From Swiss-Prot, chains A, B:
This protein binds beta-galactoside. Its physiological function is not yet known. It may be involved in the regulation of differentiation. This is 16 kDa beta-galactoside-binding lectin. PROSITE patterns: GALECTIN. Keywords: Acetylation, Lectin.
């Protein structure tokens, strides 16, 4: 699956939940949130075996179509063929991504105050998108 | 609060469920499904008091920015402040909209074989979008 959601108005405090299933041969997938495809507050990209990266979560921002400095995480609570729910929230200081085992944090570099764009790409099958 | 979902590949037989709450002071809302904003396979529009309509579901299609002939349905199972889930599925011949109280049918006028666009508009707050 790989859909795009626009016309959003997610503000700090609100929670965005993405439920789906990781393909049984996933190279990796990504979950981007921001203003648009060129300006992302967060590029959550768990990589099983993609671009030389093996079982590593890469976080990054994007502004004016330019990638920021990568932030590689130590924890990788994901496995192929796994059905997971990803919860995203943020504030003026950072973005939080919670999965049942680990909570990932990434600084709100762009100082964005609302999310209007969400896109899921890669080897992930979306089953539901919830707002809270 | 009306969002837009693009980049979809909903094939006939697949179920799209929109769950949310109708505002207590709602006058109307709509669920559009199709190719893009100007080419819709279905414009499901429950009107409480909208365009001179009082408690009536108006269904229609749109091709190249032009509405087809309005289809007013006999049943109106909605009430303001009501929390609902609207299920949509289709095939080459017709589109089905299931509401816990009533099921609506509309012919697939355009012969559309996949849904790439979904937009919810009006006095409706979306809580979740599921793909079954």
């Amino acid at each position: 699956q790989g859909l795009v959601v626009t016309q959003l108005d997610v503000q700090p405090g609100e929670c965005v939940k993405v439920k789906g299933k990781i393909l049984s041969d996933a190279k990796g997938f990504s979950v981007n949130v921001g203003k648009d495809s060129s300006t992302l507050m967060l590029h959550f990209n768990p990589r099983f075996d993609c671009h030389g990266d093996v079982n590593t979560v890469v976080c990054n921002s994007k502004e004016d179509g330019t990638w920021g400095e990568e932030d590689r995480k130590a924890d990788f609570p994901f496995q192929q063929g796994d059905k997971v729910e990803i919860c995203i929230s943020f504030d003026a200081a950072e973005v939080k991504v919670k999965v049942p085992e680990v909570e990932f944090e990434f600084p709100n570099r762009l100082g964005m105050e609302k999310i209007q764009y969400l896109a899921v790409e890669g080897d992930f099958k979306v089953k539901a998108i919830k707002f809270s």
